[PDB]
Every structure is written in C-alpha cells, then in structure tokens.
C-alpha cells in the first residue's frame, strides 16, 4: 500500500519534472532568442568568427 | 452571431492574377498560384472565396503587402488539384 | 523569509521630488529601488498575543522593523524596541501589562515611562517619536489630556485616549555609524547640495563677486529671500496645545 503511494508521488515527480524541465528549456530558448544568439545555423555559420 | 473582422464586399475581395514567369514557376513547382487582392482582406475571407467560386480545396494562403499599396496573395491549393489544369481554364 | 506578500509592492518611484515636475524638495535622486515596508502602526487586533520571529532591515527607516505573527493566522510588521528578544511575545490591548514591545492606550498606564509610538489624535496610524531611538516620556495626566515629553526637549499635553507602544525604540547605534566612504551619501538618493556663496545673484541672494564672498546681506538668507537664522517659521495661532517649547 505504501509503495503504491510512493509510485503515485513518483508519478507526480515525473509529471512535474517534465513540466518544469520543459518550462526551463523553453525559457532558455527565449533567453537565447532575445539576445540574438539562439539558432544553431546562425551559430554554426559563425563558429569561425 | 459569427461576425468577420470587417465586412468588405466579398465579390470584389480578389482583383487580378499575376502573369509573371515566377508565377508559372509557382504553378509548376508549388501547386500554387498568384492573386492580387486589396489591402482590406484576410486569410479567412480570401480562403473562403477560393473554395466557393472555383471549387477547389485551398491548402494555405500566404499574403504580403506590396509598397505600391496593393496586396499580393500566394494561394496554395491541395495536392488533389493541379494548379496547371485549373489555371489554363482561366487563361494563365 | 523574504517576499512576505506584505512588502506591498507598488510605490511612487524611488525617492521622488516632483510636484508638477519642478524640483521642490531639493537634492533627491539615485540609489536602489528601496521597496517600502507596509508596517502595522495602528494595531487593530487588541488582546491577542503575537511572537517576534524576524528583525528585517527596512531601507525606508533609520531603525529596523520586525515581523510579528499571531495565534490567529496573520502577519504584520512593527517597530521593534530596544530589547526585542527573538521569540518574545507582544500583545496590544487596553489592560495589557507594561512590557518592552507591546501597545496600550495612554490612559491605563503609570507616568514616567519610555514609549516610542504614540498618537496625536484617535484614528490615525502613528505619528510621533518613531525614529531610530526616539523615546517619549510621560509627565502626569489630566482630565482629557496628558503632558508628554517627546524627544526634542519638548512637552505636549495630548488626547489621553491615544494608542502607544511602550518601549525605547532600538537601533540607537546609527548615531555613530559613519558614512566615511564619502559617496555613500549618494547611495541614499541624496544628491550634493551647492552652497550659497558660490552661486550667482540670479540664483541665491548671496551670489558674490571676486573671491570667497562674505555673506553681504544683513542676515544670512535662504535662496528664496527669507532670513535663515532665528526667524521662527510657525503660524501664530494653530493649536496652543504645547506647554513650553523648552528648546
């Protein structure tokens, strides 16, 4: 009974983990768009500079 | 009630096709075709005025303004309809 | 615990000085944002105890403030006095005994006591003697007044039904905290003041000529013409509640 509760809390940990990591990676992508340095074509072409 | 954004005389929402060579490139290469519309137009009003007057499912409606004032509309039809067999009927 | 949802947020922007935009309170500008602290001057919860959990630095004040809870679910800030033991319990009310930190109306108390936060009339938040060491004493009471020696060397009979937080208010050691970094005046949002001799006659009345100009006028004046030594700037008939100026 208790291990199933630990699996429900673990499932809450997976759902909230995927949501928080999704929000974090999208906000990193917005922080790199706002500086003007996000798209890896515009960085991979400017690897030499 | 279902209002549009603006009531804009729907039998005049399209003005003229474009007969440049790049338009024929869009026909043979894109299954799309080129119209000249007025500035007061939509991706919802032009898109309805193609599936009714022509009888063709239109895929997308890529619009742009042109600095002489008038508006240009690249309309891409569905895969089921060739734009070349529907453009020779009009006169392209 | 910062971000208490009691710091109250939106203010008028920094140490402002604009009435219509004209400089009207001079030498202001600069520093941090200095987000204010909405503290509980007028204690509207009487006869319920409350502990003390945090002594937070209010950047708006010269002293500190403290976060006080209650037995019910609330959070307030009050001025903590000198002697605020962490975890000590304060309680406002009408018959609450005298302790360094709690509040009570000015009637139900003896005379000759150290009190910081007093009221000048009923209903107001808190007016007098709330700086970083400002302590007001009581001379004996009267029928509906109370002669109170507030920390200017000044006595004042006052309305007796006024709330008062008994205690000597702490952070006295700002008498000796030196500003010796010499640009720390600018961190408080206080621009440098120019002096009247070294201005022009269009600006100040002591706009001089060659050299360190002597003061020239019969009296040292303000930049708006009034004499700036001895001339008491007080309306002749306002209250007549003060007994003697004693200054």
């Amino acid at each position: 009974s208790k291990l199933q509760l630990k699996l429900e809390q673990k499932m809450k940990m997976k759902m909230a983990k995927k949501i928080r990591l999704r929000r974090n990676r999208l906000m990193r992508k917005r922080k790199l768009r706002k500086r003007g340095a996000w798209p890896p074509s515009k960085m991979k072409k400017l690897k030499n500079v | 009630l279902k209002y549009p954004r603006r009531i804009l005389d729907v039998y005049q929402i399209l003005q003229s096709p474009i007969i440049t060579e790049a338009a024929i490139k869009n026909i043979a290469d894109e299954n799309s075709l080129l119209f000249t519309v007025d500035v007061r137009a939509d991706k919802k009003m032009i898109r309805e005025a193609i599936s009714n007057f022509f009888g063709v499912k239109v895929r997308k409606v890529n619009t742009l303004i042109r600095p002489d004032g008038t508006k240009k509309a690249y309309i891409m039809l569905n895969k089921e309809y060739n734009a070349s067999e529907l453009a020779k009927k009009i006169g392209i | 615990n910062p971000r208490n949802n009691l710091i109250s947020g939106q203010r008028r922007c920094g140490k402002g000085r604009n009435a219509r935009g004209i400089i009207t309170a001079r030498h202001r500008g600069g520093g941090h944002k200095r987000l204010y602290r909405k503290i509980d001057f007028r204690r509207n919860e009487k006869d319920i105890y409350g502990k003390i959990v945090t002594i937070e630095y209010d950047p708006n004040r010269n002293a500190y403030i403290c976060l006080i809870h209650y037995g019910d679910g609330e959070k307030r800030y009050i001025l903590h006095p000198r002697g605020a033991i962490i975890g000590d319990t304060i309680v406002s009310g009408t018959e609450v005994p005298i302790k360094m930190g709690n509040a009570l109306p000015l009637t139900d108390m003896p005379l000759g006591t150290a009190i910081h936060n007093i009221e000048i009339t009923l209903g107001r938040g808190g007016q007098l003697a709330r700086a970083a060491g400002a302590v007001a004493k009581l001379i004996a009471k009267e029928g509906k007044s109370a002669t109170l020696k507030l920390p200017s060397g000044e006595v004042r009979l006052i309305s007796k039904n006024c709330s008062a937080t008994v205690g000597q208010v702490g952070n006295v050691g700002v008498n000796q905290k030196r500003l010796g970094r010499a640009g720390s005046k600018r961190w408080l949002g206080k621009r440098p003041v120019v002096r009247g001799v070294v201005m022009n006659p269009v600006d100040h009345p002591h706009g001089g000529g060659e050299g360190r100009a002597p003061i020239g006028r019969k009296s040292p004046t303000t930049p708006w013409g009034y004499p700036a030594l001895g001339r008491r700037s007080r309306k002749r008939n306002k209250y007549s509640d003060n007994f003697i100026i004693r200054r």
């Binding site: - | 303004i65 600095p67 002489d68 004032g69 | -």
Partner: protein
Amino acid sequence: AALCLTKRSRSRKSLARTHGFRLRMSTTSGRALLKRRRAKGRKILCTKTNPSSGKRA
C-alpha cells in the same frame, strides 16, 4: 564623442507621440495650430507614423 548634431535615429513612434496628430488634437492650442495649417493650405498638417504599415509608394 558625438557632434553638435540634433536630430538622430529616434523611432517615429515616439516622434508621433509628441508631434503627431493625437497630442496635436488633445489641446485647444494644437487644434489652433491645425486652424493655421488648414487655413494656410499645407498638404501635410502633421509629421507622423502609422501603427500598421510604412508607406504607399
């Protein structure tokens, strides 16, 4: 350092919030200015911008 040059690359949005038609019509004084512009015969009584598009030319 810069030069003693006055106008620069300020956005036309902020030039239209100051010298545009709205702050020119929000006062009795500015609409009196438009009495003098329309009374003289100027083809362009304000210097503005547009929130949608740039120029039809």
